Amino acid sequence: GSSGSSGNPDYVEVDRILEVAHTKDAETGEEVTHYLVKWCSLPYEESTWELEEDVDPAKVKEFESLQV
């Protein structure tokens, strides 16, 4: 973490989860599940997929509830 410099190092303002993708690393063989973080605050064009880790677990539950 940053010692203390004006302006946050990142915006954790997630709106919702668009879609989830399951990828498999081609180095060791570990399952890598990616979660498309939907943060309106940021421009769509900048749509990224933060690893399940970075993506809070709670938010994951909500998304699931929607899809049976």
From Swiss-Prot:
Subcellular location: Nucleus, Nucleoplasm
Tissues/organs with expression: Widely expressed.
Domain Chromo: 12-68
Function in brief: ATP-dependent chromatin-remodeling factor. Regulates transcription by disrupting nucleosomes in a largely non-sliding manner which strongly increases the accessibility of chromatin; nucleosome disruption requires ATP. Activates transcription of specific genes in response to oxidative stress through interaction with NFE2L2. (Microbial infection) Acts as a transcriptional repressor of different viruses including influenza virus or papillomavirus. During influenza virus infection, the viral polymerase complex localizes CHD6 to inactive chromatin where it gets degraded in a proteasome independent-manner.
Record text on subunit structure and interactions: Interacts with NFE2L2; involved in activation of the transcription.
Family: Belongs to the SNF2/RAD54 helicase family.
Recorded disease: A chromosomal aberration disrupting CHD6 has been found in a patient with mild to moderate intellectual disability and minor facial anomalies. Translocation t(18;20)(q21.1;q11.2) with TCF4 producing a CHD6-TCF4 fusion transcript.
UniProt-recorded name of the protein: Chromodomain-helicase-DNA-binding protein 6
Phylogenetic classification of the source organism: Eukaryota, Metazoa, Chordata, Craniata, Vertebrata
Gene it is expressed from: CHD6
Part of the whole protein covered: 371 to 431 of 2715
